[PDB]
With several copies, the nearest count.
Chain A
Amino acid sequence: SVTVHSSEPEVRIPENNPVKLSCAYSGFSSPRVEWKFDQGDTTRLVCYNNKITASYEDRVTFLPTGITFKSVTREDTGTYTCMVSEEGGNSYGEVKVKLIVL
């Protein structure tokens, strides 16, 4: 019914550089966007309800198009899962953007 995809499903950027991870979506009346970071075992909340977490507030900026980082460390390497859900949860979509800090 709806579409959730990324322009760059794999992103390789050098250390201490900015980066935007793009989340493209369509078919939603009123959507809710969520960004989760997975590095091996640890899962981290980045963005929830079109709002950035306290642990990522200082360097990440949200836009419907995606999440823009000011700088990236060796720490930030891993998968960034973007979930878009319709209010009332009748429709929802996922997309994974692999980030490789060089």
Chain B
Amino acid sequence: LPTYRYPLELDTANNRVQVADRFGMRTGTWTGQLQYQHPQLSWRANVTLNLMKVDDWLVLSFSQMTTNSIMADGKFVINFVSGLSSGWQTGDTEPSSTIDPLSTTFAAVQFLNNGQRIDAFRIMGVSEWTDGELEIKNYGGTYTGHTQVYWAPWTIMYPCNV
């Protein structure tokens, strides 16, 4: 007879050929340092983000965070080489294309200057993946002078295969 390949499954007790329930959901967590890169400023923040494999998509769920000041532009680097969950491979984070961007979102930000909290937005685009290193460009958005940045939770996803 034929066989089957994930997401395809053969149910024995039923003569059921179906699609794996886990295809639409596969949890994970990268625990590492979020690298902010710009030529005149660079810093790194300890973050622990959640991951979800949903069909042929990879979702990154950012939790609220407080970081150092950021420039008008910027890059965010995530080194998947180390930090992933149990059973998760660095290859499990590879995008299915080289198209730039692969997806763009906005982050709700607060530019903490003096005692002031400035509500502003920050556009984020999933740009590159190089030997386990994902590169999220921050094309810009709204900007004012500040000493720190408070980020509200946010999500980015991009196409991927398993």
Contacts and interface: CB of A to CB of B under 8 A. Distances in A.
Contact flag (A, B; Cβ within 8 A): yes
Interface in B80-127: 81-82, 87-92, 94
Given A45-B132, A48-B131, A30 B90 contact: no
Interface in B1-38: 3, 5-7, 18, 20, 22-23, 26
A29 B7 contact: no
B91 A54 contact: no
A87 B162 contact: yes
How large, as a class, is the contact surface on chain B? 20 to 34
A34 B90 CA distance: 8
A66 B143 CA distance: 51
Nearest to A54: B131
Contacts of B130: 54
A92 B86 CA distance: 9
A53 B131 CA distance: 6
A97 interface: no
A44 B162 CA distance: 22
Contacts of A45: 81, 90, 131-132
Nearest to B79: A43
Nearest to A55: B131
Given A54-B131, A55-B131, A87 B5 contact: yes
Contacts of B6: 29-30, 86-88
Contact of B94 (A43, A49, A85, A87): A49
Contacts of A86: 6
Interface in A72-101: 83, 85-90, 92
10 contacts: A29-B6, A30-B5, A43-B81, A53-B131, A55-B131, A85-B87, A88-B7, A88-B20, A89-B87, A90-B22
Interface of B: 3, 5-7, 18, 20, 22-23, 26, 81-82, 87-92, 94, 130-132, 162
Given A44-B81, A49-B89, A85-B89, 12 more contacts: A30-B18, A36-B90, A45-B90, A48-B90, A54-B131, A55-B131, A87-B162, A88-B6, A88-B22, A88-B162, A89-B162, A92-B87
